[PDB]
Amino acid sequence: ASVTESCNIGYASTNGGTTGGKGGATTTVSTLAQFTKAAESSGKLNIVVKGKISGGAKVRVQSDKTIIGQKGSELVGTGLYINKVKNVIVRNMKISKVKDSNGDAIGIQASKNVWVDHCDLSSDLKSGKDYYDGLLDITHGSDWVTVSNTFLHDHFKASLIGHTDSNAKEDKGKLHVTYANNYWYNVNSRNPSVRFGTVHIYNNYYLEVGSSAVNTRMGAQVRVESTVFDKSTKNGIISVDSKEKGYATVGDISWGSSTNTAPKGTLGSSNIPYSYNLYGKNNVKARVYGTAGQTLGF
Ligand SMILES: *[C@H]1O[C@H](CO)[C@@H](O)[C@H](O)[C@@H]1O
Ligand SMILES: *[C@H]1O[C@H](CO)[C@@H](O)[C@H](O)[C@@H]1O
Ligand SMILES: *[C@H]1O[C@H](CO)[C@@H](O)[C@H](O)[C@@H]1O
Ligand SMILES: *[C@H]1O[C@H](CO)[C@@H](O)[C@H](O)[C@@H]1O
Numbered sequence: 001a002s003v004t005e006s007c008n009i010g011y012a013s014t015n016g017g018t019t020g021g022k023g024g025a026t027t028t029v030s031t032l033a034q035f036t037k038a039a040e041s042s043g044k045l046n047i048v049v050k051g052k053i054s055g056g057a058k059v060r061v062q063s064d065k066t067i068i069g070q071k072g073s074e075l076v077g078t079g080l081y082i083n084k085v086k087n088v089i090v091r092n093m094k095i096s097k098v099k100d101s102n103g104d105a106i107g108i109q110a111s112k113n114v115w116v117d118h119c120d121l122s123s124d125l126k127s128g129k130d131y132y133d134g135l136l137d138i139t140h141g142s143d144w145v146t147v148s149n150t151f152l153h154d155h156f157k158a159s160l161i162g163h164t165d166s167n168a169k170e171d172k173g174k175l176h177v178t179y180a181n182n183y184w185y186n187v188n189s190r191n192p193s194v195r196f197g198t199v200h201i202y203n204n205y206y207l208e209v210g211s212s213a214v215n216t217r218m219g220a221q222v223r224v225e226s227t228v229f230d231k232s233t234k235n236g237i238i239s240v241d242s243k244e245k246g247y248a249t250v251g252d253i254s255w256g257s258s259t260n261t262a263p264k265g266t267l268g269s270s271n272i273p274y275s276y277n278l279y280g281k282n283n284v285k286a287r288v289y290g291t292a293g294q295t296l297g298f
């Protein structure tokens with residue numbers, strides 16, 4: 001892999017694309033102080049994270065940044081908050097145990113063109129349901145986001161797209177998100193939960209989902225295909241807990257113990273504005289398990 005690879009997967013590759021800090025300088029950071037100074041700075045910048053950075057913090061990531069983890073690097077307790085910015089790459093990053101007061105592990109709010117690739121995001125299930133918040137939340141009119149090759153695990157409320165039923169003016173017609181080649185393990189709910197948006201899930205492997213996997217809500221259109229639900233709740237794809245229903249379209253699913261009870265939608269193969277490579281449901285576990293997460297070599 002290369003620091004300057006641009007997004008070539010999903011919705012973040014559209015509407016101008018996502019190049020992060022390409023064109024800027026490169027810095028390597030190994031302390032929280034170095035990291036927040038680099039990430040909160042103005043201008044194009046490539047930030048390589050080295051070693052284990054621990055500390056309770058919420059980092060206000062600015063536009064035109066690439067944040068890349070070295071093998072063996074991680075953030076413990078430090079969340080990335082991507083708010084009213086654009087063109088951000090978060091890649092090969094391991095983030096864990098961000099306390100609720102410090103926000104989400106990755107929180108994307110009112111931002112556009114964001115690529116999360118080969119990340120490893122988790123907390124635990126032993127500290128209470130609200131001790132931690134989200135792993136990867138996308139809200140407040142954000143758009144053109146791709147979550148690819150990422151491992152989301154050991155956590156209650158994983159990924160929220162659209163924060164409340166009352167937010168139509170801001171969220172309707174926005175919140176286009178791709179989930180490509182991801183591995184979800186031992187997560188309880190919001191895998192993802194979607195209000196309003198348009199979400200494409202393909203080549204995902206779900207294992208030991210506790211309460212619900214995909215929840216489609218308030219007119220959302222989700223497409224789930226070439227995807228495996230393994231040893232997971234009956235609530236595989238549902239539409240619940242909102243004032244208006246959402247919709248789902250499916251293809252080439254291995255259901256396991258899970259089912260789809262969401263109303264049929266309209267998001268077909270021909271309605272996706274990018275090219276994508278389906279593995280086939282019987283090959284997803286082999287191609288994703290051990291690849292998703294912080295597995296890149298720079
Ligand atoms: C990514 O782009 C940088 C320049 O922005 C190159 O130096 C590198 O080889 C890669 O193509
Ligand atoms: C900083 O250096 C990196 C290589 O680590 C480049 O990829 C980048 O374009 C910048 O020149
Ligand atoms: C790269 O530059 C960053 C600041 O943007 C420093 O924190 C780091 O030590 C390296 O000089
Ligand atoms: C910061 O330094 C690290 C190694 O410590 C490099 O991998 C990185 O490309 C940047 O030069």
Ligand SMILES: *[C@H]1O[C@H](CO)[C@@H](O)[C@H](O)[C@@H]1O
Nearest residue numbers: 028029030031034050051
């Ligand atoms: C982590 O590593 C960086 C880059 O090597 C240093 O600048 C810092 O002092 C810490 O050792």
Ligand SMILES: *[C@H]1O[C@H](CO)[C@@H](O)[C@H](O)[C@@H]1O
Nearest residue numbers: 032033035036037040057
């Ligand atoms: C980024 O935020 C960190 C938080 O610890 C500071 O230490 C640093 O000076 C920068 O403002």
Ligand SMILES: [Ca+2]
Nearest residue numbers: 104133134137
């Ligand atoms: Ca959240």
